[PDB]
Symmetry: D2
Subunit: 501 residues, 4 copies
């Protein structure tokens, strides 16, 4: 079993060593980053099956993101395996501020009376939590007495009992025991804060990440196709048209506009953290199944995100509900499953990726029996898609160890992946940007190779690259597709069934 | 809209008021039990959708259990609604003992060296953990070095590093941070402790339970049909033949013998806490889907259990993986979903029941689209089952608000329930024991009524009881089944499609 | 096996004895009809499974039709079984005339030069065949040199080589050996003769048949819904609204207008004789399958007609192609199969009905495996149809010997028949016109009984009538439907599964 | 549009010109055979769609058969198209003998008393019918009084009223009007004549046939696999191992042993004439549908035979039941439809082939909608069959005009044919024997070409041969399969989707 379901792992301090100390150790924050020791930890997550690392720009600053991206470039070399680089934007969001004196968080008890500030550009204290509102908007008049302020995926609730005009502070009662840490997501349900089109901060974050070299952007709180097209414009103007945009669906407007968002984007991230606060929590499983189906029908990538192995933040074993969630995301048809705090923030980042890889690998064996996606229903809209349908058929008719596609742009590999064959897909492509671009497609193992010449045997190349990567051995049956011959073929036009020598 | 998926709520101190104090408040345990304030609390759980309470005999003593059962009996009169009474057995298991000087539990850090004792009838120290082993078995010779000892559904791991012959103690390294409380599960995977057929303790607990008045027994660690038959023999012997037995499947032996266990039992509880430590965690979802399908095909009851809303033990809102888990259990075909520590041991027992109820109600609306069960594949093996298939056909042909069955024993209601009609099922029955015994069947609303005479119009009765229960109004279409006429019919033989006037 | 597929048998001289002589014997035509001896022959066709007799008004005169109808009324009394009375109209057709000197036919050889007259109201001779054109139309100018004149379902072809203006005769070459008999169908393909709306002759024929007492009219060459509504108007004005209209589809205009014709009519007769000459012969099997499907979807009656056992006109055994045709008409979903010359004109009328009954009975056993009709696809458009769906389901779930419906108008019996249950359908109705009206519905055995009173047990009546008709015995399982109670029920609202005592 | 369903046409005097005279013209038999005029006639049958001619060795002598086979060989050069040569064996059967004084046949009326003789090597009189019994068996002791003797596929019945010991004759009553000709079938249902394993006569006929050059043998009255293996042994012994054996199923024993016969044979001829006298006539359609399904699942050829256009023996147009029969045989899944007396013995042999071809072409357009065969259910049991499944998938995904297979032995063409793709199949093969042997496979157009070298581009070759045959034009999409490269490939291993330039 190669793992066909892709893992997005969020990076953060959990994997980072600072002056020989690990996250949680006394004096950790007084040290600087040990890049090699950090890259060694990250190389172990790559080996365990992380296919793409997520850099959440709601956390840290550019320097911290930039160094973390450099640490992954080193980790790839140590692992001898490449991964995707995914930037996750702030979007039209509210975050808790940094605290005075670089305290990182405080703990609160049910019934404490604290304040939430609206004034922009200040720091929090334990008693007066300051907000970073996208567009530096003033939200004091948008939030009435009786509104709930939710901190960190709704873990901690603050009930607005009064408003203090002298300070423009919400007077709040802590509804339940919990923590307020710096740069935490804030939700105020049933309010209609007028966030701008694309915040200056998002424009700067995106341009910085594009300069560092990324493959993917996940756009937070996509409301309409315009939100995706604003980011697309920046990618194309900076010479970064190869970068793929995943719309994060995490509010009613995103659900209402799903069809236009899917057409504009390269994929969807089902951002269930915010989604289950911005829409009825009991509706998230309905939307999850429907989004995965539509995205797969469009030949695009879907990521299922948030709380997948939440307990593994503190404990070496997931709950029964967490394992059920990962398993059922695979059965629903997801291309990729995501870790957030499990990998970024937790005591068991490596064990989290391992555990997720084990569940994903066991669930992929039940797709023939239980799988929700139905490739038989698709219209085959092009001759490459006809070929992808024929490859699925061959992998259904007999035991195929591997499908190999020689793909210039990844088009053939994406269409084979869409049909969910009962085989791994080796995608041989001829440039690194295409190779990294395929790292979140179901079943696709991207591999860089030289562009075939008109004298090359592409079928010999396919078998040799598969053997040299240890994916197949003598006697295995593989399906190879290619455009034959090189420099005459318009598209993938040939399928070969080949016994490996 | 009526909740078709049934809720088993485990009762515990979480819902109990002690001289004005709630569970988790200073000096809670000092106070006498406020029976009436406790019954008012339990009454809210009934109103929120708890269909059966679970009395877990692994905790407390006969006095405590018997008191709790009496308090539920008052809660029913407050709520104006009856519930099922389910006894959950200790079973062939290992618990932690009570601690010296009524200390409730202790906390341990990774690398800590402590001891686990095999001598029976002793109480635990922080530094030496006593075991209450079923059958007071000496297990010291059963447990090799390098074996794993897990406490509290596997939360805390203890590696056996050495064995002390002179005290017959395990010298154990704490693997991970966690808590050792009183009367918690201990799992030693891949050991073969020869636990008795039925332990004296279980025999005593079942007999006390039967004396108090119960509807269900959930038998822990059912290994073979013999485990079910020993308990069935006590039910019959004491005149409690109406008591239904759910086999808890929570190890490989239970899985291997599942078919003969389903045949001996009235139902299966999928006990996923133990199951996911005793077998590979990533297989539990495979077994959950297969058990629900098999139990439904047998016309019996399936309960999905453990960790369903786990985070709500400590937080007012569940994680996205927990909502996914509850939803997917309903889609899989579960008759019932269960709360353990969420209702027994948590800060949010009412909100846990409400949340589960909300998810279960939403999931039931997607069983047409997504439902795994397939009633079309069933053999109809009796004339009542043919009537059940016809009822299901009527609810597929047109919009039926309610199915009404006049059922002496519940057999017709159980068959209609097996077919999962697109409608609520009102089961009009003539005794309280039959009424309570239907409370875990999917979609069944048990209601007590006078046995109709051969003078009575049972179709008028059905409509009148459905209107009086506020399940239907003028213009609603209903399907009524009955054995016509009373004193001649030997079974349900008539189906009526009626418009409520 | 009761035969569920209905047989329409065409009556003619084959069954008629004249002064002790049988059809074909010397001096036969010099005798008058022996009514009792003729009614005895016809009683044997009823016993063999003829459900409806067809009186083809293209043949004979009113007196001959009237006496044949009287002979069947006697045959019913002798057989002790009722049959339907079906009148088949001339329609907008061309027929060969009577011959001079009551010669009935002549024989011709390939290459003979004869004439066809256009002058209306004259008799034929061997050398000059006169036409009876509906509306007494003059067709001399509508038929050019090179047209084909086809006699008798296209058995004999006449090529128009010249036109003689002095006599207004077509000069024809006999294309193949064959016969021209009196009152034979004539087709001239690729001509557009302007037949009127409803010929005076058809108006008189219909009114005569309505006076004699008929159940059905098959309207020849239905072109549009107007053709059906013209006949409907006459039925309603004469107090004969109970008479059912079957549109004969036998030309392109009928195929083009099929949907409006089905909505206007009570059923379709697939008149393949003319159809296979008026449209491409290879298209008739396509249209047959499509018409049966649409008519069944409309809850109406379909008859498959012509050449079904053609060889049995002269021989005691059908060809392999004939048996295949009857079998496949049943598999396609036909309510009824028809005999024409086999019963009207042949040496083996009784053996023809027997042979057809044997094929139909063997094919009805393969409907579950091979049957084309798909009741699962129907929308259930009324509560009686919901009940019909539920009856189908019961007959699919277990072995049901009989479905009994107490039906005032036949509505419940038609809807049960539409769903094609795996059981015979006993339709108990309370007037003879309804009883005869159901004789061509698939599976329906109509039986006359007294209208139940409010003190009657309709379920006891259903079982008693079924037992007394020898359809069921002690131990058989039957499904009874009724509107319960009499004088309150709006519709069939009750289904009972009953073991016969 | 190309005819996918293949036509077997039985040759006979009907197509033979004798010194200027056609069959059925006065003094036909006086004249010498006009070989060249006969070959011109047979050439028209080839052009009209005859794919194989059947030489029925129950008629004539080696001289007659050998001459006819030579005349077909000239017809091929005239038509410019090859056909298959099928020998149909006499088999373990009873024929009528030749009559005294070269009288061709006699006519008999019902109630006529005549005799049937058991003495072998004598010629028939009108009043005493000699039998040519296979093995020259004496059957007098095999045939009881009240047994039925049927002549000419059961047209004429003869009741055995008494047995004459002194002449060993049956005294027989004519049951029905009909004809006793020379060398006609005699069936005595429910007798057990111990016919040899393989008769000397069959051994001689097969050996003569093989010496002339044939592609197929149809073995009459195959009872067991042993009947097939005796003939296979002669084919192998004489170096004729390429000859394909169709078992004729025409009695209950053949039906009972069908599975072992399909396994021994290359195909089944459903010989319905005999079958519908030897088993109940109404079962033939049940057996026809089941045989076609089984033979197709085995990847072998099925021929549906007898009475398909029977009326066209005497009339230029077929009945509606005959067109229904041909159409339904195609829908059932038949590879081939057959003409017997229609082509051999009739007035309209060319028109019979044309008519069958027209119906077969129309029916093939409805196999998507109505087709009984289901290729989705098949096990794909080899890599060539996986390629066949993939080809079928491509023709379902997009509009493919043609499938082209470069096939050494026809194995790839036979598998593609088994899958019934929505396309014609051009089979490019390198020898005439393989070419002719594919002529009865559904959809296969065999074409002879040079064996490609490892220098050649087989995909260019495929396109060029398809264009040269006028099967495709510029812009048409085609699927080509081949073993790439020649001299390395051990099987068809490549599929190409190509647009014709
Ligand atoms: O078959 P489709 O969907 O029209 O795609 C054809 C396009 O795909 C491509 O072959 C690219 O495919 P690959 O990147 O997989 O090689 C283009 O060259 C071609 O224009
Ligand atoms: O259920 P539907 O299709 O509305 O039909 C209802 C009608 O059918 C009838 O019950 C007649 O049915 P029967 O003739 O079968 O008794 C009418 O009384 C009633 O108005
Ligand atoms: Mg979010
Ligand atoms: Mg347990
Ligand atoms: Mg007609
Ligand atoms: Mg034969």
């Amino acid at each position: 079993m190669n793992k066909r379901v892709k893992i997005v792992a969020t990076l953060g301090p959990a994997v980072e060593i600072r002056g020989g100390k690990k996250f949680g150790e006394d004096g950790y924050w007084g040290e600087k980053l040990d890049v090699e020791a950090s890259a060694k930890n990250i190389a172990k997550l790559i080996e365990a099956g992380a296919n793409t690392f997520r850099f959440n720009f709601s956390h840290g600053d550019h320097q911290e993101q930039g160094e973390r991206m450099a640490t992954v470039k080193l980790a790839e070399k140590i692992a001898g395996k490449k991964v995707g680089f995914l930037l996750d934007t702030k979007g039209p969001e509210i975050r808790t501020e940094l605290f005075e004196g670089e305290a990182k968080e405080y703990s609160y008890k049910t019934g404490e009376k604290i304040r939430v500030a609206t004034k922009q550009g200040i720091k929090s204290t334990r008693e007066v939590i300051a907000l970073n509102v996208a567009g530096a908007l003033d939200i004091y008049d948008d939030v009435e007495v009786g509104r709930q302020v939710l901190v960190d995926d709704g873990k901690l609730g603050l009930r607005v009992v009064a408003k203090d005009d002298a300070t423009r502070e919400f007077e709040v009662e802590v509804e339940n025991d919990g923590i307020i840490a710096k740069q935490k997501g804030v939700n105020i349900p049933n309010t209609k804060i007028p966030f701008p089109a694309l915040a200056e901060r998002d424009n700067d974050d995106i341009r910085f990440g594009l300069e560092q070299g990324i493959n993917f952007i996940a756009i937070s709180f996509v409301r309409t196709a315009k939100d995706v097209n604003e980011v697309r414009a920046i990618c194309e103007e900076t010479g970064n048209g190869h970068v793929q945009l995943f719309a994060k669906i995490e509010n009613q407007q995103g659900i209402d506009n799903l069809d236009e968002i899917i057409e504009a984007a390269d994929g969807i991230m089902i951002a269930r953290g915010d989604m289950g606060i911005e829409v009825p929590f009991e509706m998230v499983p309905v939307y999850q199944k429907m989004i995965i189906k539509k995205v797969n029908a469009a030949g695009k990538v879907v990521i299922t995100a948030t709380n997948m192995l939440e307990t593994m933040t503190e404990k070496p074993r997931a709950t029964r509900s967490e394992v059920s969630d990962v398993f059922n995301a695979v059965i629903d048809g997801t291309d990729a499953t995501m870790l957030s705090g499990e990998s970024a923030n937790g005591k068991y980042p490596l064990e989290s990726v391992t555990t997720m890889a084990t569940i994903d690998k066991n669930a992929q064996a039940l797709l023939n029996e239980y799988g929700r996606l139905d490739s038989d229903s698709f219209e085959r809209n092009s001759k490459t898609e006809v070929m992808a349908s024929a490859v699925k058929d061959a992998t259904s008719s007999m035991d195929i160890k591997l499908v190999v596609t020689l793909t210039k742009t990844g088009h053939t590999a994406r269409l084979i992946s869409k049909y969910r064959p009962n085989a791994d897909i080796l995608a041989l492509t001829f440039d690194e940007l295409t190779e990294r671009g395929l790292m979140l497609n179901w079943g696709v193992i991207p591999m860089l190779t030289d562009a075939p010449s008109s004298t090359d045997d592409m079928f010999e190349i396919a078998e040799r690259k598969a053997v040299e990567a240890g994916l197949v051995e003598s006697g295995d049956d593989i399906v190879i597709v290619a455009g034959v011959p090189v420099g005459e073929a318009v598209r993938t036009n040939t399928m070969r069934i080949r016994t490996v020598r």
